[PDB]
Write a protein that binds this ligand. Sequence first.
Ligand SMILES: CC(C)C(=O)Nc1nc2cc(-c3ccc4c(c3)c(C(=O)N[C@@H](C)c3ccccc3)cn4C)ccn2n1
Ligand SMILES: CC(C)C(=O)Nc1nc2cc(-c3ccc4c(c3)c(C(=O)N[C@@H](C)c3ccccc3)cn4C)ccn2n1
Lengths: 261, 271
Amino acid sequence: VIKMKSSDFLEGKVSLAFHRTQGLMIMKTVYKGPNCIEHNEALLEEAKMMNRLRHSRVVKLLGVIIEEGKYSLVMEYMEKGNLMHVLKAEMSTPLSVKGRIILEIIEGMAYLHGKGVIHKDLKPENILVDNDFHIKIADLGLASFKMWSKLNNEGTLYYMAPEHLNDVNAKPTEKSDVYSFAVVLWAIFANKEPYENAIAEQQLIMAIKSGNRPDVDDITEYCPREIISLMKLCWEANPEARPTFPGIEEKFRPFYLSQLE
Amino acid sequence: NVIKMKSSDFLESAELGKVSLAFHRTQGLMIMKTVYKGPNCIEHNEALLEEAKMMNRLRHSRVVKLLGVIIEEGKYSLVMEYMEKGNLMHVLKAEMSTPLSVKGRIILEIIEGMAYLHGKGVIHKDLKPENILVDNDFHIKIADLGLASFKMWSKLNNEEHNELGTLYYMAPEHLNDVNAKPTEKSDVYSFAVVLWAIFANKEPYENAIAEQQLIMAIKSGNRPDVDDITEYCPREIISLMKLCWEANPEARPTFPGIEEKFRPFYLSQLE
Ligand SMILES: CC(C)C(=O)Nc1nc2cc(-c3ccc4c(c3)c(C(=O)N[C@@H](C)c3ccccc3)cn4C)ccn2n1
Ligand SMILES: CC(C)C(=O)Nc1nc2cc(-c3ccc4c(c3)c(C(=O)N[C@@H](C)c3ccccc3)cn4C)ccn2n1
């Protein structure tokens, strides 16, 4: 990794970070407390793994600050924030830009799966948009890498595959993210969070485990048919019935090319 | 009553409110928890000393004895006996492995301490590996690091002028329900998860993804994964933990009942 120092920056919490020589970046300070040196080795290894994720649709980890009792992650800056914010903005997104966004999400998820990363929390809060309306996948909640995830701990459920609802012990798979992505598709075309009421509880968890899905009739903007088919397929209760992201890409890229671009 | 001590009774300390190893000029090593550093207040002083006398009356070989109280202008401190090897989770994750007989004894000693506290009308409310301390001989003592048992030092800790929370062991009836009164059955549930953690050498629910997910899952019956125990674990201990984390509090045994079952078992198959 690149190791940064707090003194490298102008003077969990997610903040704008001005590196005194490299400029604008994003700082997430994961932990500030009395020491835990016994953990550093595993944290720096996972950080290196973080550092190796290099893709235009994936948020890049610029540096780590590993200091006595202070753990921080430094990331590349995305101007326009997360996908939900851009969707609900006062202006609109042509269907072509939404098609391109969806393809970019597929490409990033396929890259992450090809590097052995299961995101575990794909959701609109974790899809960042740059000034040109291109996206990058992020992990604001530290869900993807286990030791940084624990250190962070030393919360929407709307995108959680039903197999993880009321069952925290089953191991998540690539199909977990495929389910999340399906709900992301719906949300992209609804410009709102699923389950119109927008309350989370045991009623809804049990409803979803039994097959309830976001209301396809709650789409009040135009949504292409093939995309509705794709999301319906991807949120199948049976994890085995859901495609892989490379399969999704072999389907969606030619459709986006022929009908959307 | 208690022993009221002075800050000047100690030569020095080293940080571990603030928890410190402190050297008493006459008594030697002790553990100091400094609860409040601020402007002076008698807003509780009388009750505070009363509560101290109360926590001083807990005298049992498996409970951390309160050694002294420091009540000074703007400074409030509790002083406890020192436990050499720290808390149970740390000892479990140590490089050297712990013999199944020693884990059996630890479990029995926890049972004994919990029985004592319940027999003196004390509901711990926060039993967990962090509150189970280990001496140099691998004997345990139950502690209350979070000031859960005595409410007004707890208030003093949170008073807005003082310059100075795991849920894996919280019985499901108190999750997302901040009003339910904890009972002895709560402490039994905590004991059940501590048993699991003793034999898995780690915290439960590692692939839990989000806190609401885990909270709703646990309230609906999810428990620690018994297969994730990868070292030998006797079958009655699996039975005991399954019984003690029963969703219905009434179905859970009591600590005198747990001890009745477990002590002969430990004698005949473990010691
Ligand atoms: C309103 C706001 C101020 C704005 O306007 N823009 C803006 N907000 C952010 C927030 C982050 C951000 C924050 C915290 C992060 C991450 C990113 C991240 C990460 O992505 N890790 C990579 C390596 C990864 C990706 C996929 C899977 C696994 C790991 C890990 N954490 C903890 C980054 C850029 N921006 N830009
Ligand atoms: C791990 C460290 C790095 C190391 O190496 N050793 C080490 N840490 C400690 C920490 C304590 C400790 C700290 C804070 C406490 C308490 C104890 C306590 C209490 O137990 N009160 C008694 C009377 C009681 C017991 C049961 C129920 C109700 C009350 C109340 N508070 C706020 C004691 C001994 N050690 N030894």
